[PDB]
Design a protein around this ligand. Structure first.
Ligand SMILES: [Cl-]
Ligand SMILES: [Cl-]
Ligand SMILES: [Cl-]
Ligand SMILES: [Cl-]
Ligand SMILES: [Mn+2]
Ligand SMILES: [Mn+2]
Ligand SMILES: [Mn+2]
Ligand SMILES: [Mn+2]
Ligand SMILES: [Mn+2]
Ligand SMILES: [Mn+2]
Ligand SMILES: [Mn+2]
Ligand SMILES: [Mn+2]
Ligand SMILES: [Mn+2]
Lengths: 85, 99, 108, 96, 97, 78, 104, 94
DNA sequence: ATCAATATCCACCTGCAGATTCTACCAAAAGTGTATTTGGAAACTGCTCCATCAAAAGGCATGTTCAGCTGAATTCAGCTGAACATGCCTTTTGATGGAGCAGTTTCCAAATACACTTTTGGTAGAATCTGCAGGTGGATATTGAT
DNA sequence: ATCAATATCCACCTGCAGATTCTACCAAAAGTGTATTTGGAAACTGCTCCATCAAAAGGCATGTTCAGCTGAATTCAGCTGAACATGCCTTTTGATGGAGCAGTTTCCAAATACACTTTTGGTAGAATCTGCAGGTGGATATTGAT
């Protein structure tokens, strides 16, 4: 990534979180929801990326493929349609 | 006037607008960095197929939208219209994500 | 020898029976696969997809579009009590959600 | 020196034309369909595999597929699938 | 005439049953209901002793867990009394609805 | 029959669940819930019974049924 | 002269190996797979019995019963999560009352 | 006799190693039996899929390890991965 | 918060009933010694993609100002739900039988696996076809202030 | 009870990125001809399961009382939405390079395939002991009076 990647969870802006809550039908949002959502999202991604990477290392590859991600999502009971090629 | 909408009207306009569309609500690049950063801490020098990141973004957004749905039901159950951390906690607990 | 007749044409199906049979043999599901199994399964798959394309085609038509897209599939699936049950733990990429605003949120 | 990958795409397209002669499908939509066919396939074959196992049988037959279908699918969707499945078998065995 | 205050006995009951592990529903009533329900699917069926006990262990466990979630929903709404509304929210979120 | 699951019985289950106060509407709501539970499981249990060509529902049949429903049970053969 | 003793285990390498090939998991099963698998099972079992053994001790029982297993399991965070969707017949629940429910 | 087999002898042996003074009721043992069968299927099952995804026909200790890494939470995984590789080595040594 | 007067828990104890543990014997499995295959790993090598960076444009995130109206606090009592004493009967539980049926064996006709060979249906680019994304405008609601 | 003010639709158009077709091998079905495996079709067996039959002992269904929780009705300090001006940095396209999937070959360490021999693990009565049922006696609390 050339430049060190740091503190990117802050890339998930207040507005991007607001649009997500809207789609989920939320009308009013407390001020503390933003950090909480960042904390929950991080846990969600770590859990999935972890399993995905494990499939990658196991295939002795250096490239995380959509399949690795698809298989990891399924393990978490989070099945995804559209990326099996 | 200057014309000014009442608090909640535009919020409602936005709800209708996003429940009607399917585009990703989080920006691409920023989401991409987050994924590479998190992954970087598990195994260094990993590469990613463009599709891998897209799959991750589709899954995360669908997950959050759904969480907000449940979170909203919790807030409403407490006679509120405003979602708060306690709502996301109650929902994650009931879902069995943090029982 | 006799002219070739595909197992799909024999069962009167569009889904590949030979394909499915191979997939079953090589998926380590059992030591042996009966002749009727791939027919039955290949037919159920065809039935289920024909059943979702029906509903998605309509949704596409309700939106004055001639091409089915992920959103039409979501609408179809989530608006059908049973399909939704079946795909309750599945997510359709680029599917969005069903419009639904909790009444208490509407202006009073 | 080719790398050919199989898919359910042509079959899904033939079925789409049957139920909607005037409709087409975006490749991304086709991607959802292919994911769907593989998901159900595995869910069904999986249950069938266990069935034969619990019953000490080494062969998965149309009977195992059938009960798996009654186990995985909700109400009406199941009766329907059973109909199509049974119909296809009887027609196939009669070399019809 | 001695008379405990409302709640004190309910609490004493909570400690009692959370400490024990026996089935809380009467055997015959349950068994009879299982057979009845079973009839609406397959006919003239026989049941193994252990099969009915297995179903009962699962039910109680299931209802107990549901009541725990229901309780969290009631407490979330500033109440201490569970209401149908609480069971409904809980099942909504568990994906049972 | 569903009435066989009495009020004091539902109270007990709720107690182990930590519930201190109960609305009178709860008992019938709980019977409805319980019913759907038994149906979903017994449906599959019996289906396992019928595939094995048996007339007797075994503990395993139930165990497999609980497993499919994501309610894995321990102590009855599986 | 059994494989279990050759791996320093109590759990059945031979039987684990047989369950693996008969289980329709793959056309072939390597030599070390059963060893590794038997080991993980022995480790998980030891882990639970250890704690359940304690629970039985603190209850003054010489015999472990389901209550003890359910206690061992639910009070340990990782085991609880491993068995989050499992139910222990005759295990009951962890005593626990929500603070708002207590008087004074 | 045929009838059926369980893990009873083995579970009783591990118990004696950790609590020589302790025993186990019939039901608790029934529970351990279930437990063992359950974990077994989860790992063998995950190992099966792992092997299939990479187009491998044989299931080795490498697939069991990754399966354990995927199924066990944190520390439980670390200790299981150690006991496993540990057992392989000994088995392979003598 | 104390006293007093109940009311419930909670060890601890004894006498056994009945779970466990302990013994002794096999069928069923695992272990052995040889003998032969073969999945897949190591060694290249073609060439897809993926990592990164450059530029220009402009879609969006940010910080700021205000004040609408939502969450949080309170108060009050109507009436729901808990605690209890009663009286009844449904659930326990204890036999006794009869038999509906899981469980097993021995065969064999009917169904599957497999190596070899034909015969396409499928798939990967090219070569065509075209929806409908983006743009434009008036027509129609939908608000919010008067 | 309106009307500027804005946002939301609806219908029309066009050409180019994204489907659909058209081509042509060719991987992989399907057709043959054997070589195994099976699923049961009968015929028998001990069982676990229903069926009744019959005391009765908790447990539950009821009817009273009334403590105190759930909601309704208010109040109002601030948080959070609505609008704006800024100007940062995400999007879009493409260019470079070369990291690393994927495709092929070659060939052993490792896995399968028998033929037998050893060793287990499952069973079921016998021989232990360990909880359990009841009974206290003494903590621990509750609840009402002051
Ligand atoms: Cl909060
Ligand atoms: Cl068949
Ligand atoms: Cl309610
Ligand atoms: Cl191995
Ligand atoms: Mn049609
Ligand atoms: Mn080879
Ligand atoms: Mn309010
Ligand atoms: Mn009052
Ligand atoms: Mn052709
Ligand atoms: Mn448009
Ligand atoms: Mn040989
Ligand atoms: Mn022995
Ligand atoms: Mn006692």
């Amino acid at each position: 990534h050339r430049k060190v990647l740091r503190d990117n969870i802050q890339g998930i802006t207040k507005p991007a979180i607001r649009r997500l809550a809207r789609r989920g039908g939320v009308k009013r949002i407390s001020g503390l929801i933003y950090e909480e959502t960042r904390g929950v999202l991080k846990v969600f991604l770590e859990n999935v990326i972890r399993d995905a990477v494990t499939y990658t290392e196991h295939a002795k590859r250096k490239t995380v493929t959509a399949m690795d991600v698809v298989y990891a999502l399924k393990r978490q009971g989070r099945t995804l349609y559209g990326f099996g090629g | 006037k200057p014309h000014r909408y009442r608090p909640g009207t535009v919020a409602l306009r936005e709800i209708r607008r996003y429940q009607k569309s399917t585009e990703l609500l989080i920006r691409k690049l920023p989401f991409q960095r987050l994924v590479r950063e998190i992954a970087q801490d598990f195994k260094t020098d990993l590469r990613f197929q463009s599709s891998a990141v897209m799959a991750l973004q589709e899954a995360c957004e669908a997950y959050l939208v759904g969480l907000f749905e449940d979170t909203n039901l919790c807030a409403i159950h407490a006679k509120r219209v405003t979602i708060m951390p306690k709502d996301i906690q109650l929902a994650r607990r009931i879902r069995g994500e943090r029982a | 020898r006799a002219k070739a007749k595909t197992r799909s044409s024999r069962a009167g199906l569009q889904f590949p029976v030979g394909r499915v049979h191979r997939l079953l043999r090589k998926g380590n599901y059992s030591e042996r696969v009966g002749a009727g199994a791939p027919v039955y399964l290949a037919a159920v798959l065809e039935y289920l997809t024909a059943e979702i394309l029906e509903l998605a085609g309509n949704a596409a038509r309700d939106n004055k579009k001639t091409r089915i897209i992920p959103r039409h599939l979501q609408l179809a699936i989530r608006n059908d009590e049973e399909l939704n049950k079946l795909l309750g733990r599945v997510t359709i990429a680029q599917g969005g959600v069903l419009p639904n605003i909790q009444a208490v949120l509407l202006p009073k | 020196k080719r790398s050919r990958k199989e898919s359910y795409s042509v079959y899904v397209y033939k079925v789409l034309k049957q139920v909607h002669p005037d409709t087409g499908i975006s490749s991304k939509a086709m991607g959802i369909m292919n994911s769907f066919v593989n998901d159900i396939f595995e869910r069904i074959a999986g249950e069938a595999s266990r069935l034969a196992h619990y019953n000490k049988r080494s062969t998965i037959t149309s009977r195992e597929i059938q009960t798996a279908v009654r186990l995985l699918l909700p109400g009406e969707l199941a009766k329907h699938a059973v109909s199509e499945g049974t119909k296809a078998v009887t027609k196939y065995t009669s070399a019809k």
